[PDB]
Amino acid sequence: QEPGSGIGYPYDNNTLPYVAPGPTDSRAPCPALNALANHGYIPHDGRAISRETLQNAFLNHMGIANSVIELALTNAFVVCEYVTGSDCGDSLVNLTLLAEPHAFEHDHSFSRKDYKQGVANSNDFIDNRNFDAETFQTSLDVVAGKTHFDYADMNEIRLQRESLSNELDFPGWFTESKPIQNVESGFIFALVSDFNLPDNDENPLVRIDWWKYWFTNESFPYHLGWHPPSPAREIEFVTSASSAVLAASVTSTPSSLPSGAIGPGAEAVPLSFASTMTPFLLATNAPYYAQDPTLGPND
Ligand code: HEM
Ligand SMILES: *[C@@H]1O[C@H](CO)[C@@H](O[C@@H]2O[C@H](CO)[C@@H](O[C@@H]3O[C@H](CO)[C@@H](O)[C@H](O)[C@@H]3O)[C@H](O)[C@H]2NC(C)=O)[C@H](O)[C@H]1NC(C)=O
Ligand SMILES: *[C@@H]1O[C@H](CO)[C@@H](O[C@@H]2O[C@H](CO)[C@@H](O)[C@H](O)[C@H]2NC(C)=O)[C@H](O)[C@H]1NC(C)=O
Ligand SMILES: *[C@H]1O[C@H](CO)[C@@H](O)[C@H](O)[C@@H]1O[C@H]1O[C@H](CO)[C@@H](O)[C@H](O)[C@@H]1O
Ligand SMILES: *[C@@H]1O[C@H](CO)[C@@H](O)[C@H](O)[C@H]1NC(C)=O
Ligand SMILES: *[C@H]1O[C@H](CO)[C@@H](O)[C@H](O)[C@@H]1O
Ligand SMILES: *[C@H]1O[C@H](CO)[C@@H](O)[C@H](O)[C@@H]1O
Ligand SMILES: *[C@H]1O[C@H](CO)[C@@H](O)[C@H](O)[C@@H]1O
Ligand SMILES: *[C@H]1O[C@H](CO)[C@@H](O)[C@H](O)[C@@H]1O
Ligand SMILES: *[C@H]1O[C@H](CO)[C@@H](O)[C@H](O)[C@@H]1O
Ligand SMILES: *[C@H]1O[C@H](CO)[C@@H](O)[C@H](O)[C@@H]1O
Ligand SMILES: *[C@H]1O[C@H](CO)[C@@H](O)[C@H](O)[C@@H]1O
Ligand SMILES: *[C@H]1O[C@H](CO)[C@@H](O)[C@H](O)[C@@H]1O
Ligand SMILES: *[C@H]1O[C@H](CO)[C@@H](O)[C@H](O)[C@@H]1O
Ligand SMILES: [Br-]
Ligand SMILES: [Br-]
Ligand SMILES: [Br-]
Ligand SMILES: [Mn+2]
């Protein structure tokens, strides 16, 4: 928000306004990076981004500690080198390259389509990067009529997304990615679980309105009473939440799940790509921004 607004106070004492991305700005497949860029906490153009820029932006503006993004930073820079063909040093070339498929970006996202979702021909690909309202509605439908949801509900949401994606993706494309997705499941609990409930750390419940505002608007739900978690969330919370999601008993089983979907997931580790492997072409779509309604500087 505008710095003088005080909307972030006393959790964020140095806010900057929301500014929609323009057609030449680079955006990510990540709702967090996109919100940061929209506020200029990382470059508004989404280009030339250092590790420390990311660390400070997450810590000071989202209540997300450095530990939470240590592996994400490693993976971002691995993917930058893979996509561009050269070491990116400590200047991430842009955010858009993070949507390189079957890499850091993965299938069965909560709010993005898959790279070969619903394509008629094998060489086709689509926008697997920008927020997609219909896809996100398939996630939200699992918790329809509710204000909050728990680990078991999140497990059901990701299973629904895996089912749909395995059915809809071009044959042979779908590749399950429980380790990365469920770090992201943990990120959702870390950012938008309801810290106003007494037992949030033992038993976090996502506020659906906060989640929907963050994802749809790629800005922060201050108007709904959200603020950055304080103290900042640490990695322990995120991987515990990830494990709890996958450990939760499944009471409704969609059809068409890949083998081993129900059960624990592997620990996330650094990505690596063969030097001979050429990257898949990135989707070239202009960055998404919310239009129904458009957002003002304080939204
Ligand atoms: C350097 C830091 C980060 C990098 C490089 C990064 C990168 C990415 C990438 C590549 C994806 C796409 C995965 C896919 O859905 O196919 C993604 C998704 C996601 N990210 Fe980030 N991320 C970072 C930090 C965070 C943090 C700290 C949060 C929240 C606390 C966050 C929340 C999410 C969520 C919830 C998704 C899933 C979106 C969906 O499934 O629709 N990310 N991120
Ligand atoms: C974010 O950075 C990535 C990585 O640099 C950009 O993707 C790459 O964009 C370049 C154009 O600047 C593409 O190069 C072109 O490739 C075609 C086919 O190989 C070639 O015939 C052209 O002469 C040109 O070299 C490159 O393909 C593309 N990389 C991938 C994997 O798709 C991306 O455009 C940047 N996005 C933003 C919004 O800044
Ligand atoms: C996206 O952000 C807009 C702007 O903040 C949201 O619309 C406003 O919501 C706030 C509460 O968050 C209300 O006080 C305003 O009356 C709303 N204004 C307008 C112009 O509608 C919108 O709800 C957000 N989208 C989602 C899905 O959360
Ligand atoms: C991205 O741009 C490519 C051309 O550079 C197209 O071949 C791709 O289909 C893709 O097009 C989409 O996004 C561009 C902006 O980059 C729009 O101009 C297109 O209409 C389309 O939405
Ligand atoms: C915001 O400023 C107030 C008033 O000085 C201070 O008490 C509080 O600790 C500050 N918050 C942060 C995150 O520094
Ligand atoms: C989440 O999982 C990690 C291991 O991946 C632990 O280090 C952490 O304490 C939490 O259990
Ligand atoms: C790891 O931490 C999470 C988040 O605090 C808990 O919900 C979980 O039960 C485990 O203790
Ligand atoms: C990972 O951690 C979660 C949260 O403690 C457990 O529920 C799960 O069984 C696994 O150990
Ligand atoms: C069985 O229970 C889980 C959560 O406990 C739900 O998410 C599911 O919809 C079914 O009711
Ligand atoms: C229980 O929930 C699962 C996952 O959302 C559905 O696929 C199933 O049809 C039932 O509603
Ligand atoms: C749906 O079905 C699967 C196996 O058929 C179970 O693992 C799950 O708990 C749910 O009953
Ligand atoms: C979230 O984190 C847990 C614990 O490391 C994994 O088991 C899961 O697959 C996901 O990466
Ligand atoms: C990471 O691992 C891959 C193997 O999958 C190698 O190709 C790469 O060079 C790096 O060692
Ligand atoms: C977002 O931008 C639109 C332009 O379409 C305005 O009409 C709206 O009031 C908001 O500022
Ligand atoms: Br660029
Ligand atoms: Br489809
Ligand atoms: Br796994
Ligand atoms: Mn994806």
Side-chain angles (χ1 to χ4, degrees), residues 2-299:
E2 290 158 3
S5 73
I7 286 165
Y9 178 91
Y11 299 101
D12 182 352
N13 291 345
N14 299 102
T15 63
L16 291 170
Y18 170 94
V19 179
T24 69
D25 290 329
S26 177
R27 287 291 178 277
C30 177
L33 295 172
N34 290 349
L36 293 173
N38 289 344
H39 286 269
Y41 302 141
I42 69 183
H44 186 76
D45 70 3
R47 295 186 177 92
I49 313 181
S50 73
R51 290 167 176 81
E52 183 176 14
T53 298
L54 285 154
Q55 288 177 318
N56 291 159
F58 277 107
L59 178 66
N60 296 143
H61 303 293
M62 292 179 60
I64 294 301
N66 294 357
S67 62
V68 175
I69 64 167
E70 184 181 350
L71 180 55
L73 287 171
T74 298
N75 282 339
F77 281 89
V78 167
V79 172
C80 188
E81 179 161 10
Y82 168 45
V83 170
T84 66
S86 55
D87 196 309
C88 300
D90 193 32
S91 189
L92 190 72
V93 167
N94 68 28
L95 289 177
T96 297
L97 66 82
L98 296 172
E100 170 63 25
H102 287 170
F104 201 163
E105 192 280 325
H106 60 77
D107 294 336
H108 59 88
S109 295
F110 295 112
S111 70
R112 272 63 174 171
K113 293 188 206 292
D114 290 352
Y115 188 74
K116 297 193 186 275
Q117 183 175 325
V119 301
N121 289 102
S122 71
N123 282 127
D124 294 345
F125 63 94
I126 62 161
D127 184 352
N128 64 332
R129 176 171 39 87
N130 283 308
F131 176 79
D132 185 63
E134 184 275 340
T135 301
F136 191 44
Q137 197 62 45
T138 73
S139 293
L140 295 170
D141 281 348
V142 176
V143 291
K146 290 168 58 52
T147 64
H148 290 72
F149 71 82
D150 65 16
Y151 288 139
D153 299 318
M154 181 65 98
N155 198 30
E156 294 282 3
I157 293 172
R158 69 91 189 185
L159 290 165
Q160 185 89 140
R161 297 299 310 121
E162 290 193 34
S163 173
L164 280 165
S165 298
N166 197 27
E167 292 166 314
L168 294 168
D169 288 353
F170 193 85
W173 176 257
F174 176 87
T175 302
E176 196 192 48
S177 196
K178 285 164 66 176
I180 300 168
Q181 173 151 73
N182 295 287
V183 165
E184 292 148 6
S185 298
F187 284 171
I188 295 163
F189 284 93
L191 196 72
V192 291
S193 69
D194 192 344
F195 45 60
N196 297 134
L197 301 180
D199 60 341
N200 171 242
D201 288 348
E202 305 169 348
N203 188 43
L205 303 180
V206 169
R207 264 184 71 167
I208 293 164
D209 57 358
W210 288 354
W211 189 28
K212 197 185 174 181
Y213 190 116
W214 168 29
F215 272 40
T216 306
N217 286 334
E218 294 184 342
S219 194
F220 302 112
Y222 282 112
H223 302 334
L224 298 172
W226 179 86
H227 59 72
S230 179
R233 297 289 194 193
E234 302 277 349
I235 187 64
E236 286 72 24
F237 180 101
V238 168
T239 67
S240 177
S242 170
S243 172
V245 171
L246 294 181
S249 183
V250 179
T251 57
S252 179
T253 302
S255 303
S256 312
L257 288 171
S259 176
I262 298 177
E267 180 168 357
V269 299
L271 294 168
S272 183
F273 302 90
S275 263
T276 70
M277 180 176 191
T278 61
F280 290 100
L281 291 165
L282 295 163
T284 50
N285 303 251
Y288 161 88
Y289 62 96
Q291 287 170 68
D292 185 20
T294 60
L295 306 198
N298 294 140
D299 298 334

